[model samples]
Target chain A: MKNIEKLEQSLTYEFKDKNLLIHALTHKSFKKSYNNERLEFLGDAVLDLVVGEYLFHKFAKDAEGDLSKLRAALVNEKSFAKIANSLNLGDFILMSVAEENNGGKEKPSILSDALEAIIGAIHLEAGFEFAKTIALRLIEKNFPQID
Target chain B: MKNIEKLEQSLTYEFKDKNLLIHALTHKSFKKSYNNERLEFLGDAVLDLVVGEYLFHKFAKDAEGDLSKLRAALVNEKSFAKIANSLNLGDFILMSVAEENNGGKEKPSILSDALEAIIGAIHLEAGFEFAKTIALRLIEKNFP
Candidate 1:
């Protein structure tokens, strides 16, 4: 029964359009429509650019192969799941009763999807700059030793 | 030899640092030190965001599945090669003499990589906003 407002508090930013936040947390298992699918799609690409730009600058002299390898390591399900757990995002995802009982909340794919959706919602609501900052914060917090 | 200035004319934007443009056009086959590979990596992600944003807005009601399909159809080698050909990019790529003789310039993968590298260079030189605008222009033009 923990409310999404807690998510905003943890995120350190409130939403002007609360629907976007809700839309991001809305799992397809909750309903077919208004799910986080599209937002996840957008967020997937957003993270690629955000992380790419980040690594591009961090490893300025690295070749494309090295950069690609570094990005792949951090941008996948396991890493995102780790980041999601950092936020305790499993508690906030709106999923079906059956899914919740099936351990959907703890699923890495679900957690990653939800995390990306939140990032996408932030991008749509605030802007890329803020989204990038927020995403970088999460990434840096989780993987501080990236080199 | 068609100078890269013609590329500027086609792009409708000139480079602040001409080296970026040259760097973008430099193929791995041409040299090992500095090439478009890193820029291509950056541009690859840049285009994903740009195109994802474009499709997200353009097909407002489309689902993620449909959007993915549309993006895949447009973002692949064939599509990018077609776009590169529209710009006559084959003429401008800096490849090895052996590669040129091997018809590397006309190769789809090379053409696509060079096109993406150019987009990546533009992003670095200007910003994502301008890069998105320029990419959208090229996508619309060649696909138009």
Candidate 2:
């Protein structure tokens, strides 16, 4: 199946505004560029806060420092790219034909940015509670061993 | 004593280019200001790597997620501002006369940026080792 189809199935929530999803997948190099940079920025902050809160509550006995570190590891580009690859988001990314041919699909930065922008779009479409629920579920699925 | 003087005494490292220090302490509110935003950006990345390595080694058993979170907590604006307050960096901050008179010294954002810029300046003067050592020392002092 195509990457978008797989993601849609996995998400279990069809986007009312498909344009948002397209925007999320659009890299800056695309000709009719609707880059995800702004959404990525907003998503970055939202992810931090949501993850921070989760870590804080989950590890009640842990020090503030430890909780902070955990949040960073989960949200950083490396980890985001790993998650994106697992979801096969790279296959659906919109870039210039040259970029696509040149392996833009496997680019960690672009994949991570797209993931964040998608999260941002979701947050905007839904409310914070719904967004947090989805985010927490995704993160939990990624790291099931988390106590 | 001024905030800068106290910070110098505590760190035991004086800036040869005091202008750097002064600029670091300048807030963006000062028109056409040479504030510490650029330095903050540099220090933000530096702190990420330095603290990332520290936590990585310290918690060998932990996963990458855990290490990154701890680094974020240490380096974020809230934490930085707290450390800056401890060092009383607010007194040295140069803002508009109105802002200064209005007590902009207590602004958390300015304090945090100034602290990061100071760290950036120190990193430039000395090497990574020196920067890391000072950061670790600061952390120890803050926690203790």
Candidate 3:
């Protein structure tokens, strides 16, 4: 994660529950009890909702096929990984020593999953509207060309 | 649509915004505008939130991995399609002549996506709490 100041700057939403942010960044391989898995699930949905809604509203003429296609592109591991890398997500992800040596830190898949988990953690603490802010902040610019 | 009244009976939640219900049942193939696309997007989010919360609470001892695994299993095309079929969603779907000829109504992908779209419709017309009730009602029994 970017330094707390930088991470918060990236999100534009300061953490009310700093733990939620940390929890989201932490991987299951590091600890069995609290991990990013559930948050990732929630974040996946949150990511879909915010971005889908964004696409829907932004492109009134775009059909569902078009809207869904764009949304699918934005939510995938690559998009998430790119945004995560920008925020230095790999730097903050808490992983086991073995997984860390195996390059879990820089792995796109892990970084992306943690990013979504971070999205979920924020949503859970903040609500849909604010969550949308964090989501679009990170990914809205990634939209492919559309007329 | 399933006669607004019949759909209400099935959902067990009456809607003040009848259009929301119709929008969910209607397919994009039927019309480019006033389609279910927006609602489907919203519904996917609602479905995830409700189910994620459900599993998080249901399996107290389970970790995030277990809860999310359960959620992924519950929320999917096959699962949503099964529930939609049980509700006779095909009967309500609005289709284009070309799409109907191709059997779009009976397609699992169509039914499932429409089901989620309806979930979004219900959410918009209603609210998260009530929308969650409808989502769980439709697919919860399919769970166990």
Candidate 4:
């Protein structure tokens, strides 16, 4: 019942590479940092494609403009921070004492980065299908039904 | 009708300072002469806030992550180009002859900047409430 275990239980997707998850959770400020920036970047792209496909399929008649707006509304930093907070990700984040003390736990940018890194880690561990499934499920749970 | 006029008609808002609209349509290549970069910057922020509020209210249960993703997807160059094309914005874009001949008409960044400037112009002309109304309506038409 460590943080990773707890996260896995909550997410219902166990990580094949636990190290990936650990690396994802490690912030830039940590002394032994394996920063999650690269993972976040990849995760951001993965999320883009998955969400783009989902929105396109879900709202078939929506023009390119509408689809873009909907996607943007769905995937910005504020939204990422909310999802990260829901997973209680702050408790397990590996950051320097200064960062931790500065209430980095609640900062939108850090939380969002962690969330994207986690998505990247999940994508790496579980393959795109599994990762996309989990991502869509998480999105469905968090978002209101698409009109 | 002119391209700006057509865009105005589609947007249902007129520019108080037509220069703003012109600037929006101006490209960076003619940078020193005159351009829309500053207005594009303002428009960028304006679009973000306006769209953010709309999505926030529309999808009350949505987390910040989903909203961010949606916003990114919405505001990127591709989407902007599509919107700009729909309005036939390329016809009105002011660029050097060389740039124009080189197919600058369909550039994503230019289209995106134009869309931002259009929004910025509307915001300035009619105020935020009017701008938001137009924005929401555009979203409903394009997205709903």
Candidate 5:
């Protein structure tokens, strides 16, 4: 029913493709962008590195266990999916009923795509510098401990 | 051997602490260099992102797989070992006696693992503030 401005804010970036914007508000910029696999791969590393860095600094009083638990929580599918669901992201992911991917590879397709896609899109849209802000913001929304 | 100084020159960056350099040269498999492990994780991402970004623009017409194959080729133990082997990384590695007995600091495994550890080292060496630029220079040495 309602879209437009909603899409602009959920990921906090712009999408030029209108058709993709209309598909129940799913996010698929990477599917068209190509190198999605590689981009997502790099994005995964970037997310971990940044989140790792964030925790490394944020909880100065805590041990590596702090780094361990928080990052695991921060990077896992459930954390991302919960945030994605909070944003109604799954409502947007169009899954193939045939299910070709089989939870097989490194990053799980649907949820990982949405999380990694959002990160990948931000990085591609701007650069690592800008991508850091977007990623930090998403993490901040999900975890208060991460600053 | 003629190392460290030359290695510094080759990398074009000096280390404030030589221990970090040694740590970067160390691997996680032996339960060593946990610091470097954190840095490696970050550096692994840093390398991929920077390298990925480079390939993305360089091979515009190339398919996504083109980007994948090349970057994958770049990040592997073999590729890293090539650069590390050239750098004499195995000699500088810090291995326990048992680990040393295992040739812990030698071969494709340790040398291969050191590249990212160095990348991770640089990231923490200066923080991402401009650490990104420093790392791009280090990784670029091999590419060019």
Candidate 6:
């Protein structure tokens, strides 16, 4: 009913199942029969691995001490929210009117969680390799210099 | 100049570069130019992903709350140290005489970190896919 067609273009992937896309954008606060919590959980770990591997190779000569700090800085809510904003993800989140009125869409925590859930949904829809590609694409596009 | 041959049998994967294995087993306390800290960092994340995926599928119907709790319990130092102990990993760690004298080999923190470093080293020597196999194998065998 919403502009579901536009999100895949920005997300750089065409979902085989549109329902999965909708599921990812859904927040528990939306009061739907299913929320994005599980997807968010899976995505949280996916981002941890993807960002860790990214830094592992990016700073090949650096020690893990440096890698840990870099991954922490990059894979956090601030960074995810920035990437989410780049795609205007706040406009697509499905939250309750009460929540949307409270600016839930723009909230860093909400944006980041939704972004993670999207990645996790991509993981489920595609696979780890594809999800990794999309995540790296987003990271590179948003952060630029880290590669 | 240690019994590196036996490690592969226990770890269930042979290293293309044996030096990588040594680097992984050598603790900073051994006063080496290299240590297992870096490997531990990588393996920590690797295990997070692997075990996360494992539980993600194992408890497919469970919500994120249960999955998160299971992962937290399974991927901690205690779990790792226990897995390491089953493989007699403490006996394989290369530490200083002083640290060894202080029972550092059997220490849970040391054992867990070294186990993680070993996984990281395997990732470096083989690759992530292979490393994932070895890690899951180790997790299954040790925790069995």
TM-score of each model, in listed order? 0.93, 0.51, 0.76, 0.51, 0.68, 0.89
Candidate 4 structure quality by residue, lDDT tens digits, A1-147: 256799887677888778878888888999542577666765775676567557645754432245567767888998888888888888878889899999988898999998888887786677555767888887877776836
Output the lDDT of residue B21, model 5.
Answer: 78
lDDT of 6 by residue, A20-82 (tens): 888888888887468887788889988987888777776667543577778889998999999
Candidate 6: tens digits of C-alpha lDDT, residues B60-122: 675435887888888898999999898788888988999999999889999999888888778
lDDT of each: 0.88, 0.71, 0.79, 0.73, 0.62, 0.84
Write one digit per residue (lDDT tens) for candidate 5, span A61-134: 44245465767888887777666665666544544433325432222445565666567656665666677787
Model 3 lDDT per residue over A18-137, tens place? 888988888989887878877787788778777766776677665535666777887888888999988887878899999999999989999999989888888788776678787886
TM-score for the first chain in candidate 1 comes to: 0.93
For candidate 4, write residues B1-144 as lDDT tens digits: 255677778877777777768877888786564666545654665566566545544654432246667778777788778777877888888888888888898887777788877776676566555766876676666656
What clash pairs does model 5 have? B39-B120
Single-chain TM-score of chain A, each candidate: 0.93, 0.89, 0.89, 0.92, 0.66, 0.94
Interface RMSD for candidate 4 relative to the native interface: 13.7
Two-chain DockQ for model 1: 0.73
True contacts kept of each: 0.85, 0.00, 0.63, 0.00, 0.37, 0.59
Which 10 consecutive residues of model 2 chain B have the lowest summed lDDT? Answer: B59-68
Q: Per-residue alpha-carbon lDDT of model 5 for B57-103, expressed as tens digits? A: 67756553567778787778777877777677777665567777887
What would the C-alpha RMSD of candidate 5 be, to one decimal place? 6.0
Q: Which regions of candidate 6 are displaced past 4 Å?
A: A63-65
Model 2 chain A weakest 10-residue run by lDDT = A59-68
For model 4, the docking class works out as: incorrect
Query: Can you give the DockQ of every candidate in the order shown?
Result: 0.73, 0.03, 0.47, 0.03, 0.28, 0.56
In model 4 chain A, the worst 10-residue window by lDDT is: A56-65
Q: Which structure is stronger by lDDT: 3 or 5?
A: 3
Local accuracy of candidate 1 as per-residue lDDT tens digits, B4-72: 889998998899999888889998998878888878889999999989988888887745358888889
Candidate 3 whole-model C-alpha lDDT, 0 to 1: 0.79
